[PDB]
Amino acid sequence: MVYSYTEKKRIRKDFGKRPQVLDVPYLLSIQLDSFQKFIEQDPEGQYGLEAAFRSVFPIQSYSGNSELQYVSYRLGEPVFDVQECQIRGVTYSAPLRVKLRLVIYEREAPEGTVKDIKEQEVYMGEIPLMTDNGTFVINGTERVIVSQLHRSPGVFFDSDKGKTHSSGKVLYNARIIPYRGSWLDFEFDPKDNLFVRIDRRRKLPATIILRALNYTTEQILDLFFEKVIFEIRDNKLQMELVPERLRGETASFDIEANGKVYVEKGRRITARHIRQLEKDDVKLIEVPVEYIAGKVVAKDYIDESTGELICAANMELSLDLLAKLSQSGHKRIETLFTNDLDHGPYISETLRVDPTNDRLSALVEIYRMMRPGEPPTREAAESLFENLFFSEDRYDLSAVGRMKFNRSLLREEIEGSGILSKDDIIDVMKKLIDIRNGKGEVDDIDHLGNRRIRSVGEMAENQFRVGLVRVERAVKERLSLGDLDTLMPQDMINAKPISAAVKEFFGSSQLSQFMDQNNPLSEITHKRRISALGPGGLTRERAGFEVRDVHPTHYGRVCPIETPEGPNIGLINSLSVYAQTNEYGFLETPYRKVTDGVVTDEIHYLSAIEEGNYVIAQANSNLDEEGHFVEDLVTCRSKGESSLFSRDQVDYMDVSTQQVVSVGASLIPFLEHDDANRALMGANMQRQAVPTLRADKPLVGTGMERAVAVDSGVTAVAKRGGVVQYVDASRIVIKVNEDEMYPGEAGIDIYNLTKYTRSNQNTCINQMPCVSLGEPVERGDVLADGPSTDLGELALGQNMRVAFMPWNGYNFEDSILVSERVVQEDRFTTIHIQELACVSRDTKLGPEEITADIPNVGEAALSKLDESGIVYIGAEVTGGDILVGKVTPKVKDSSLRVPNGVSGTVIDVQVFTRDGVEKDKRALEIEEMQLKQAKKDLSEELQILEAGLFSRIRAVLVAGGVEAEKLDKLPRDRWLELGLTDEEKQNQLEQLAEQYDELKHEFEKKLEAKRRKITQGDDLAPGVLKIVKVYLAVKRRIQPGDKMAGRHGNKGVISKINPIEDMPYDENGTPVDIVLNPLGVPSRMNIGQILETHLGMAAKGIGDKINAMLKQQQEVAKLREFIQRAYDLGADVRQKVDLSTFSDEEVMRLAENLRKGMPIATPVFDGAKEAEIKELLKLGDLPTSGQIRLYDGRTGEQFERPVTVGYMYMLKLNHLVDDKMHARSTGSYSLVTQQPLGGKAQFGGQRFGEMEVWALEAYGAAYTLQEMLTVKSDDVNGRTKMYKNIVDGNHQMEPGMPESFNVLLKEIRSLGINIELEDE
Amino acid sequence: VPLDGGRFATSDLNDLYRRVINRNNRLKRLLDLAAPDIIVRNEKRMLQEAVDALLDNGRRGRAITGSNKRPLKSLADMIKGKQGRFRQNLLGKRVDYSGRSVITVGPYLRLHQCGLPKKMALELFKPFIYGKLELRGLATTIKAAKKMVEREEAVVWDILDEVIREHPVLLNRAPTLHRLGIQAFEPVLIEGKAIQLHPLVCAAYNADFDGDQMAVHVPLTLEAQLEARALMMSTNNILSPANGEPIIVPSQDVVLGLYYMTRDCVNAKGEGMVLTGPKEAERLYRSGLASLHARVKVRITEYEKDANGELVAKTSLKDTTVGRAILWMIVPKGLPYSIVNQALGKKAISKMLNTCYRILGLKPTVIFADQIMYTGFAYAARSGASVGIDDMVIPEKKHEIISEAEAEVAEIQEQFQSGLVTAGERYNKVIDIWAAANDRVSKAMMDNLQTETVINRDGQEEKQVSFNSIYMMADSGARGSAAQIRQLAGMRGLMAKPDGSIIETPITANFREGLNVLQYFISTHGARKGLADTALKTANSGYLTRRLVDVAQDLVVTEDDCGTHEGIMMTPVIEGGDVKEPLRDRVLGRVTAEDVLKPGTADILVPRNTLLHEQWCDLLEENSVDAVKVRSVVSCDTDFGVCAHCYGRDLAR
DNA sequence: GTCCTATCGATCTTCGGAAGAGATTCAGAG
DNA sequence: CTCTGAATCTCTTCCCGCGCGCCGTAGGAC
Ligand SMILES: [Mg+2]
Ligand SMILES: [Zn+2]
């Protein structure tokens, strides 16, 4: 057994029992391997930019009769890396270069080119790149593309009751949904006439398509219907009985011959009669003329002699018609079999709607129904009809759509073309008619086998296609008209349409979300959201219980708990922990192979429609350490049904008890106990915790923290193994070991940590070291904590000591009462960093300046600016302080002032300048910083190679060919001028001094390039001269009104900040830190929070025994004994750990991190039994009831009965109150109508909205209302007369008439509608 | 308007008029230059099709756009509907002198107060503050007082605490379904930043305290203060508008405390002695000499208001408990002690409070309600009424009840395994076997909770009502009655599929114990349905109330008595057998339509237009009356309104 | 690079809203 | 031959507050 060097510092005591056979996949492979799938070229041309290019090129005009064609593409390295790009505020992007070859043919000749011109990689655009954290950077702002989930291409059959006609019956419908191009709907009319339409246009008679494919009705009838024949021999019109065509229906008429009668008139027909029908060989039989007089004919019948019609396919027969046509010599008359149950006549019925004659008349009807007002025309019509279904420019089932289609038509194969074909539509019709004949089933729409995930690497491939589609339309024309003589490919194309397409996508699409960089969980659970909304999806306002609800295939694929309750429940889901995207995009999830009777430890991923074909055991099911099930019969799910089945009947097993959830819920301990309301609100509140100041560890967790904090990319992780060379909380630098070094390198990995910086939500993000100088580290160890982490565990909140009890009502209803001790400790203080910016311009009156020489203001304000016109770093500032002394010509003091209300310390400034514009000493101050920071880190390589190279001189001197009359005092390349002879050592000296010079020249260009990065200005917007951004850090504390939450979806405002003496304290005199209310636990059934408290209490107790054993100077062998006795506690828990191997050093180093509570894991559905919590509390010296008697610090009286006390984990949420408290006396008003502005970002007035006005009207209160909506609001006179009457204290109003109502009058009178006020 | 740098905001109409005027410039040209019919029919079409845009863009074949297919908002799009003047700016509009904050509970408030932050009061009341600094002559005028407020000088608070000293401020949450959703309170100043609201009133707002923001408005004029104090002040609104039922209905912790205070425990310290009054009952409690729920006898006095309305005071021994003696001290002097002499719970105390309003009236009732609140909080504290997992009680018969029912389900299965029962019958009987198990588990668990308390009566054990923590909360009506405790420790029971059809194998577990993965996953088909319903419903409910006020708003009570003799007839609603509502629900407080006779003949009982107030409806309940004819607003023959008598009792008064 | 003039007058606006009601379109017949 | 039934089309409605976040005419000709 082994633990990595960052595990072996706080080995979380694990209570899990099921052995985790599959370790959690890298939590963002959803995203990264999607974008990698876009960005890689791939000669198997599907997927990626290359697939899109090969979707358009080769490209040509017929009249140009020449082409240009895509050869290959290259993607250059990005002009600025992520860190610098995120400073400079551009987007992190890469230049796209494409080998286009233009080919010039000739007339008359064979096509052999007159010339062709490979343009040496024409520039095509700048595609953004994904950062390894899975995020794009789009205008310095960091953005995330959520995966979409939408209806896969294919064919889908559907039906409903009551939603249509409601006379008990149901109507059936088929759709073909291509990936790109037109939708085709087939549907029956109630009277089972069949109809078709494109793109939800008008309804058409369905055979209009078969007509359009030029089947005659005779052929259609041979495609759809079974034949029944009459042979006019042995007697007039004998009949071809196929026996099985009579079963269950009544023999209402005479059928007999030759010996035993099968079934006489009026009786059902059955098997024994059919067998007698077979044994008599009923190949022809006598039937009454009423039977033939029922028929509809199959085939066309002219009279050959007159040459003229008597009957036609699907025309209906009668005795006299039969007589004349058989009399005309047509001795075989042929018709259809149409039993109403099994063979309904729907296509013949459709031929009774049909207005068409044949192909052309249908194409006429198509073109007139689709493009009303354009002329139909034989040469023109096909340029509609073919581009509906048969042409690549406008119809495309991708490979997934073809697969799904073929699977539903039960085809043998799935390598198929993306267009339809005649037989491809006909098969849909046949399958739809089988459904109406009752012999088939409709698909469940909302099934994760019918909806597939699209992620970034596919949405961007489509938007890039829209680009190439608009270049198609330009380049075809330019090629067709062009001379082909001077044009080269970089004339043929230009980037602007591609760049528009892709930049608008990544910038502004409904799915290019601005990342919730709130804390490391919220980064991740956002990068793996599954969204039903957006382009090609549904809409949040326009769906109902059919899709919001969970479905049985969600299990293991989508988390049922973690969805953002509100107007879009379940239109957003979170992709479950273990789930994965299949090749095609369907969600698939890993299961264990059950081989005969033993659970084999191999995992097969199952998609949602493989799963229904097996029976799959629930993850809890026990096994015998050989791996046979222990239970003789076991719970499994099967076909959405679940039940018990035999041992060795079951065929797959779940991989882990965590498989059903997302990371967002998988982090709740004891989830096994909570109402799924309160699980949901928990798993939504964890992603809102703001990173507190001094974050640590949850004492009770699930062991998922060790993964969320690492995979979220925000802790800095050791890229290669080695030893820590230096640390200073800004840099960490690692001497990588030679077993993982690359041979020419210096061999030294710096990590410049990010310090105090705004998150996208204004919380700070300073990384801090966890290493010590000279400490060893191994690849993948956490070197530095992120925000909200410590030692690499996720740590959103603080393990506050809580007791559950009423307290004089301060924790009524939900509220949290808090002791002053928590605020004094800086437990929940949090740092909020704002960014304020002053732009400056080349305006129409002339160019602005930044200066201290501001007009109309004296040193009373300017004392905080430097001499340049920017605030000093470390200035502490408040409302109205001038941060940046901008001024405008013709001079106007327009300068950046700190907005009202806010306050903070100015932690940093940045300065950006156009080209050809002068700097200033705060630009030179920033240059001095950044230059020096680049140069230092470069020197720490050049120094290391210089030292190595002079050793490489010294050693092969000192070992042999010594010249050491004096040695180390000398400049170690002046060592060359010593008198060594022209034996090889002097030539080694000369060569290695040339290697030393070239080592200098190497950095002599590397530092020049770096300084050139810093020396330059930046790509400002048009009009601006320069911009400066100034950052205010605020250390906000905690106060009444702030919100805190547990993990269990318990939440409250904190209501009072009680002084320590008022907190309850125990029989040992320690006060409780928080007092939660009890009644919420039964009333909202989230009792898992109690077991977290008790297990938390035990967690404190073990640290309590350890801390005592470190204050007392216990020897390690006794201390190790107690720690070991803690890890081995419980049943056959999964984990094993041997402090015997920890070398004493690391036992003390471990104890020094347990000494405030042993951290515990309670994996989600696999937790501690109660009997193991008691066992831990007994190992501490604690009361196993979990409860303690408490006393009230207001009197020292005892409380009656003990109360729960223990260490809950509590999160401060980002809804803290000073960010919401607001009030307005008077200030701005809007221009169009004079009502007040609305906001906090503007000094706004609260909306006395519509419902409040009914509320006043429902008291008698008329004067209040009159005021509220005029004098206080709108009447431009009355409010200034009111204000003066109030300062005069007159308490009287003059109410007038609101100016918004006069706006209405003019806006009506701006129609030709004379509205007017009237007098009497 | 210009925006960020030298760019005009795309100001839609000016793009529409621009279309028109361009087209008109061309059409004047091509008319005067005398173009042929086909050309002028072109421009004339394009002009008509442009003025079409300017009036009501998008009633055309397609709305015209100037961006990524954003339709430009035309005039008629400015008038109508949810973003247009009538709803957006006329009917309700933003207002000055307002602010908002997170509310938080303030237990010490008297019912009429709320605390609001000094920062807000100072930024809200500014006009009134200037109206004192000039009146002190301490500031020269606005120009100085503005600065003197900005500097936040030491005087200003003593001025503020004179400005505000009794100026009602209006607090309302949003949405605000009903009149009780805006109320006025006298403010009291606070150091923090939250609005301290009164505990009992949070229920009216449906203000939970979990971070639920609330807006405040100052009324400016004298008339707005007189309306606020007379009508909207919380003391004037103890009743619902909708039904004769209090809205001050006690907060869960208050009723928990009063339940705990008034129980009897058959063994206690100081049990069985005899006392001369509540005061020495309290000395006995507070010194720790008697336990609060100990049995005792006390001398009591109580008061009754006679047939005239004047007090008769009476005195007796009473047999009771220490805590019922202490609680009697809070009741105003006119109620009978028989209302307190019982272990109180949420229904029992609501009627307590209601009877106070019945007998004394409003002004004592609001103070009595305040005292109840303070009392319940204080004894609920001493009670230490915690919750703890050792207090979840599982009846061990549960194990047998499953192990029995499982085989009987397998009997239904074995018949099915022999074809001996139909595919419908197998299912619809199995789910009834699970129901028969579930009722038994629930019944055994409620018996076990009551069973957990038994104690030595100085010799031999005897049982009493269980002090088990979760059972106090159910049996008191604080929170979480039968349907919750059943799930916490009984069984979770049957669950339903998405299409409502029932699961063949229930959740026989409960949240004290673990759900396995499947039981949990099926559990979410419940809860996610219930959340989808909430988020989906909250639209249609609002569109319903809109349609209603916007049809009802034309009515006002406008005559005293329209003079009808017509009306409609009220009976208990008798259906499905028994009566689902008695007559005293329907008829109370309407006026009689016609003379109401004695059951029988010729004896009249109520004159023909008398309000049937409570003493009349109790009288009808003394009689064998079944049907009563009353006036109803549908029959009131007032034109353009309703007469008062036809409407009858005002429920809030 | 700036200023002025115009929109697919050589396509393709999205299927995944329901409803609920009206205006407007057609049966079986006196 | 069109008169009362019914049939397909479009129009209109869809909680209240609130807080962030960003993003914001183009193309051609002189
Ligand atoms: Mg709330
Ligand atoms: Zn009336």
Side-chain angles (χ1 to χ4, degrees), chain A residues 814 1043 1051, chain B residues 173 206-213:
Chain A
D814 279 306
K1043 183 167 178 162
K1051 42 168 167 145
Chain B
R173 196 171 174 255
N206 194 11
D208 46 12
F209 284 104
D210 63 343
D212 189 279
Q213 300 168 48

Side-chain angles (χ1 to χ4, degrees), chain B residues 475-493:
Chain B
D475 188 60
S476 63
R479 293 296 294 181
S481 62
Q484 278 72 44
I485 65 184
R486 183 180 288 157
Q487 297 180 67
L488 286 163
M491 69 160 76
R492 169 66 183 218

Side-chain angles (χ1 to χ4, degrees), chain A residues 1033-1048:
Chain A
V1034 194
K1035 194 193 302 175
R1036 298 177 105 105
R1037 292 168 57 257
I1038 189 163
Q1039 68 222 302
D1042 283 332
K1043 183 167 178 162
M1044 302 203 306
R1047 287 180 291 193
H1048 297 280

